């Protein structure tokens, strides 16, 4: 019998690699455009260095493909199982927190200040992001070290001559327990963002949060359906395609409008204009 894993000759593998290359280059363009304009409202309203942290994490996440492809090793098991997915969840947590801040803060201050000031004081935002981060991290560690750090193999269901090599035992179950927390975060951020669809507060970014969360939600549901109806060789590259599409749904779908306005609506970057939106 014969072992199977992704390799650079394959049409879908090279296609996905090109898509990931597009994502990485666009993210780098975003980052540098931000860096030059670091002192201006469009990026200062984005929280400044936090967005550079997020963009660094996205740049690292786009580096998955060369590690995802080829014959696996224990190190590649760690990379595929934990290191990159955690980088994704970290970013989604920050998007959710900003979604909450944009729409809910003023109302909560006007209606429940004695409780909400506990979130206002100390380090509420960082506390929320860290709590979600360690939640995902510990769940990932539990799953990975329970199911094993070595590669796993199975017999193909309709051409049994080939055996398929992967790093996620019980693929549907593993993906469920990986993505459930991210689905929760997605729904929460989408709810707050949609309640904020009218607000201009920070260059209308509630609208873009809604759009990006939609792009993530549809892809996640599609992947869950596909894994509920298919088991062949394609799974281990459909997962990668969905991962890259999610990374695009963030990198383009949330940051792109900001740089688009920086380039082609610089008048709105003037403080005198920002004072009409704040």
């Amino acid at each position: 019998r014969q072992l199977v894993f992704l390799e650079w000759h394959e049409a879908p593998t090279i296609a996905v690699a090109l898509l990931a290359a597009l994502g990485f280059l666009s993210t780098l363009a975003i980052l540098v455009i931000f860096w030059r304009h670091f002192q201006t409202p469009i990026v200062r309203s984005a929280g400044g260095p936090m967005c550079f942290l997020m963009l660094t994490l996205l740049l690292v996440a786009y580096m998955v493909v060369p590690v995802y492809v080829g014959p696996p090793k224990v190190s590649t098991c760690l990379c595929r199982q934990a290191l990159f997915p955690l980088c994704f969840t970290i970013c989604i947590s920050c998007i959710a927190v900003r979604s909450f801040q944009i729409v809910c803060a003023f109302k909560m201050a006007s209606r429940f200040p004695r409780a909400y000031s506990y979130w206002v004081r100390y380090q509420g935002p960082y506390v929320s992001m860290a709590f979600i981060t360690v939640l995902k991290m510990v769940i990932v560690v539990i799953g990975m070290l329970a199911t094993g750090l070595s590669p796993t193999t199975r017999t193909d269901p309709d051409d049994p001559k080939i055996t398929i090599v992967s790093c996620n035992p019980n693929y549907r179950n593993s993906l469920l327990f990986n993505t459930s927390l991210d689905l929760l975060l997605s729904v929460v951020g989408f709810s707050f963002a949609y309640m904020g669809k009218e607000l201009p507060t920070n260059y209308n970014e509630a609208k873009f949060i809604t759009l990006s969360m939609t792009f993530y939600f549809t892809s996640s549901v599609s992947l869950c359906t596909f894994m509920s109806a298919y088991s062949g060789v394609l799974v281990t590259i459909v997962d990668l395609l969905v991962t890259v599409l999610n990374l695009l749904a963030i990198s383009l779908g949330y940051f792109g409008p900001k740089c688009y306005m920086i380039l082609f609506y610089p008048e709105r970057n003037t403080p005198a204009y920002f004072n009409s939106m704040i």
Binding site: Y194, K207, L211, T214, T218, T225, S228, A229, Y230, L234
Partner: protein, 275 residues
């Protein structure tokens, strides 16, 4: 000895779906009747005039397509089942896509580009868009009927004392070749409308379009696991149900409330409120 097995005309699983077909087709043709009677009024013109009627007719054909699934299989039935559903479905969905295009352009675009582009979403060029969508659907169906044509399969072994005859799809992954166009049109239609903000004192097409596409996607997401899990004898029933429930999801959500406004609330059918 073995007896053949397939969805029989008169099996309750078939009759209960034929009654649903009766309801859906009756609602569609009643909506068309109300449309024809109030053809010139603002609520119809704001729906693209004859575009409304053509969409309803395409939906009616889409519903009537289910009669090919039950009964004794034949090669013609096997090859006809999918195209006869999804081609009229394209002919229907493209009109809702045009409505979403209008509601998006006139709410989320600068006024110069809005007043310029809106001219090409009406008249001859709207029929051009519909025709292009239908042509692409037909091309992918022609690809399907050559690269992945289904066959009448006789399966002696999968039942304990009966012979299963079914229109065997070679693989589910191959069946997306006919879905992709309708799915992408539905997704674009949804994205075009789901985030719009209503002006006060005027009608709001975007909510109807949004909920119609939401029902479409709920139906066709539920369709896959049901097709995977159901007994091999009743997959035609699942396909018929998916078709009819999708048609109902569109019909109850988009056309029917306009019919309701025509019947109960004609005071709203005014130039100021709709146009």
């Amino acid at each position: 000895p073995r007896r053949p097995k397939f969805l029989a005309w008169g099996e309750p699983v078939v009759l209960s779906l034929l009654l649903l077909l009766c309801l859906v087709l009756g609602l569609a043709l009643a909506a068309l009747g109300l449309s024809v009677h109030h053809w010139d009024s603002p609520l119809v013109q704001a729906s693209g005039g004859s575009q409304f009627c053509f969409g309803l007719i395409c939906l009616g054909l889409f519903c009537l397509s289910v009669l090919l699934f039950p009964g004794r299989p034949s090669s013609a039935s096997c090859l006809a089942q999918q195209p006869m559903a999804h081609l009229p479905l394209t002919g229907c969905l493209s009109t809702l896509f045009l409505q979403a295009a209008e509601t998006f352009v006139e709410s989320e675009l600068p006024l110069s580009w809005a007043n310029w582009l809106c001219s090409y979403l009406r008249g001859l060029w709207a029929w051009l868009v519909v025709l292009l969508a239908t042509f692409v659907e037909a091309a992918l169906c022609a690809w399907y009927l050559i690269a992945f044509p289904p066959e009448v399969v006789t399966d002696w072994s999968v039942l304990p004392t009966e012979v299963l005859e079914h229109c065997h799809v070679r693989s589910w992954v191959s069946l997306g070749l006919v879905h992709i166009t309708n799915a992408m049109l539905a997704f674009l239609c949804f994205l075009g409308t789901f985030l719009v903000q209503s002006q006060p004192g005027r009608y709001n097409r975007a909510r109807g379009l949004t909920f119609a596409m939401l029902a479409y996607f709920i139906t066709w997401v539920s369709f896959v696991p049901l097709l995977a899990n159901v007994q091999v004898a009743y997959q035609p029933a699942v396909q018929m149900g998916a078709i009819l429930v999708c048609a109902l999801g569109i019909l109850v959500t988009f056309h029917l409330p306009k019919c309701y406004v025509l019947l109960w609330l004609p005071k709203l059918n005014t130039q100021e409120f709709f146009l």
